[PDB]
Structures are given as structure tokens and as C-alpha cells.
Symmetry: C3
Subunit: 123 residues, 3 copies
Amino acid sequence: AQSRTLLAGIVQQQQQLLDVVKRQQELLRLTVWGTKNLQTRVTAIEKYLKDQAQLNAWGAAFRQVAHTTVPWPNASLTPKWNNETWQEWERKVDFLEENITALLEEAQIQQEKNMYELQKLNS
Amino acid sequence: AQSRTLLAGIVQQQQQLLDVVKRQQELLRLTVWGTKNLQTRVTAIEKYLKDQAQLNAWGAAFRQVAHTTVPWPNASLTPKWNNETWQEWERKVDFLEENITALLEEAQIQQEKNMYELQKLNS
Amino acid sequence: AQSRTLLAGIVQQQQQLLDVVKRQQELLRLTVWGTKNLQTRVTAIEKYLKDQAQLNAWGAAFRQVAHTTVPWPNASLTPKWNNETWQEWERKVDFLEENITALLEEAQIQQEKNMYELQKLNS
């Protein structure tokens, strides 16, 4: 009179939920790539911003043998405050990622065991 | 002596977990919109960067009837390398999204069936 | 002849899945911070873009006591269309976040109850 058939469905439902959770993990990685990719473009833009500062006044002098160049900084480069804070951000993802992998590995071992034990009841 | 009341709670817990997973999917879409929205702003910025290149030296000549215009490229536009790679990124999200929807649809059909069978035991 | 040992494993598997889901929530917050952080950098860049517009032609005149300054807008600032739309984006995350917390709180109360009832069967 045991509801093993019902347990088989419940145990299977957990497996399907585990698979979807894993998919979210891979989808999250794709989103992280887009954000980082934008930063690479930003670095290229700072460089061009610097080139402007070089552009100030050309030929602004026809009775002098000199050219005035004023390369005043344009892109505010972050050396420490963002870098140190950004490293912390990347690291937290690393600890959470490692933790999720540990739980997933345990769920797989346990999920297989739950199913293996179920087979023994009706093997 | 069967623990159907306990199964009712377990089956219900799976339904609540399924709902939260779905919420993460919608939340993920909102995050994707913010990243893409930033790219649209970036495209507008490249345009203004191009306008600078046009600015070089105005009136830098009062004894000549000519103006020196040097529109040297400023924004490095990505035609293929990023576009081809970005398309792949968007596509992987598409295949993972389609896969998650398939698993969710199966979980709903199965979740309802697990509950429907439980009612039969105590209907 | 009841499979309580099997239920103990199934109930435990749900707890492990709940923990991983929570981790995704915290990981999602880190991703949101990176996107917003990029916007702060963008605001700094608009400012420097504005400074360029100020740079037009310096010393472009040695027989006149005047300087031509043309600060034509450079960064297209979004006052309403993006702000109003961005607020909606942040708000939807707020409603989904609040909803996920409610479901998580119910799952914890129910998860503990499912385990508590199981102990009674074999306490």
C-alpha cells in the first residue's frame, strides 16, 4: 500500500528542479561576460578621450614658430578605489560559485542515492 | 499509517521552489535589459566622439582663406569581432532560456500530476 | 515498512535546493552592482565629453583681442525617458525581490515543519 509510484514522481521532480538551477548558473555566467565586455570597450574609449586632450589648438599661430599643445587629462582612470572594490566583487562571485558547486555535487550524490534506494524497494 | 499529510507538505514545498525559480528567470531578464540599455548609450557616445575628431583648429588662420579640418576616427567601432561574438552570447541565452521553459513546463505537468495522484489516495 | 529513511533524504534534498536558490539571489545582487557601477563611470565620462565641447580654437587669433569658445553639447544627457524607464526597471526588481523573500520565508517555515513532523514519526 506504499505510494512508491508517487515517490518516484516526487524524486524525479527534484531532479528536474536541480537541472533548471544548474541552467541558471550557466546563464548567469553569460550575463557576467556582457558586463565585463562593456568594460573592455570603456578602456578603449578612455584612450580616445585622452587623444582629444592632445587636440587643443593647431596652426593657431602664423607669426610664431611654435604650436600650443595642452593634453589635459580627459578620462578619469581608476587605479585603486575601483580596482580594489572590483576585485572584492569578483571574489564574492568566486566564493558563491564554489559554494553552489559544492551543494550541487552533494545534491547529485544524494539525488542518485534517493533514486537508488527507491529501486531497492521495487527492484 | 501512511504519511500522506507529510507528502502533501513535501509536494507543496516543491511547488514553492518552482515558483521562486521562475521568479529568478524574470529577474534575470531585467538584468539583461540594463546591460543592453548601456550599449545603446555607448552607441550615442561614439557619435559624439566622432564629432570631436571634426573639431581640430578653427580660425587658426587669418592670412589664408582656408580652414584645416582633421576628422581622425575617435570611437573604435566594432563591425565583426564583437558583433559575431555578441550574437553567439545572445544565442546561448536563447538556447538556455528555451531549455529552462521546457523543464518548467514538464515540472508543472508533473507537479500537478503528483498532487492529483495524492488527492486520489485521500479524495 | 514505511520509507521514512527515504523521506529523510528527500526532505534533506529540498533543503539543499533551497540553499542553492538563495545563493543565486546573492549572486544576482553582485551582478546588479557591476551594471550600476558602470553607469557611475559613464556619468564621469559625460562630464569630460562636455569639457571637449569647450575646446574649440585657442590662440586661433593673433590680430584680434578675442577668443572663440564653442561649448556645443557633447554628451546627450537623459533627463526623463531613461530615468522614468530606469526607475520602472529598478522597481520591478524590488517587487520580484520582495516576492522571492516571501516564498523563501514560507519554504523555511514549511521545510522546518516537514522535518519536525518526520522526527515525530521516528522521534
